Amino acid sequence: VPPEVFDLVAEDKARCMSEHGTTQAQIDDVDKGNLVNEPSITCYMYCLLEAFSLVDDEANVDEDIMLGLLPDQLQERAQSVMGKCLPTSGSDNCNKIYNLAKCVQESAPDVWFVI
Amino acid sequence: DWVPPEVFDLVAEDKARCMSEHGTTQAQIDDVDKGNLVNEPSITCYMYCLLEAFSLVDDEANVDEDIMLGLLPDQLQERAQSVMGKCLPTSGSDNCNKIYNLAKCVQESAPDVWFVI
């Protein structure tokens, strides 16, 4: 019998949504580049980054792992955005990630990367 | 003021890039997605490329089990820990063959479980 196939990204998103009461409409908003400082979505964003080892349990970004998501041709651009936007800051892990996302959006308004 | 950005799905972009860079056909990707592998670089270096794009392995065939375990779902954690304990570290004739052998080891150990981007 063929194996059951598990879509890792779908699973990780599902788990993070369920942990924070996040709706599909909210995740679809973030996917369009529309950001709001509302914990039900910003805590989802933190959860998902943490699942990918992009941040630790205090929402500090692991720059090597974050740069590691991108192709070689985008490394210099990404390094420049990380120079403007790291280290993270904010009142809690979720607000740290809201502030990061806003900084990344404003620093590179032409493009928006999503998992 | 906000302007709509061009949105890029990392997974979609990574698959398109990796396909191009390794000569992989759509049929071959479809086979990978169903768990059917062959020890041909157009397949195995494509799989390597997708893993590397999420830091699951370096450019020297070293797999990071801690990053991997974080991505797997809760209900597979115990099985995944056991399977990866059995199948790591990698071994093989070259970078891409190491990933072929890893995939085959995981499939032998857990024939009912296959994970995809």
Ligand SMILES: CCCCNS(=O)(=O)c1ccccc1
């Ligand atoms: C860059 C800051 C925005 C993060 N958005 S995200 O949480 O959906 C996410 C995107 C990509 C990988 C993991 C999580």
Ligand SMILES: CCCCNS(=O)(=O)c1ccccc1
């Ligand atoms: C030039 C394109 C902007 C780069 N954005 S980013 O570095 O914040 C980034 C976003 C999501 C994942 C990894 C890095």
Ligand SMILES: CCCCNS(=O)(=O)c1ccccc1
């Ligand atoms: C056992 C080795 C995994 C191979 N599967 S995959 O190439 O689709 C893949 C899964 C997860 C992330 C990236 C690529």
Ligand SMILES: [Cl-]
């Ligand atoms: Cl940081």
Ligand SMILES: [Cl-]
């Ligand atoms: Cl702070």
Ligand SMILES: [Cl-]
């Ligand atoms: Cl895309």
Ligand SMILES: [Mg+2]
């Ligand atoms: Mg890399």
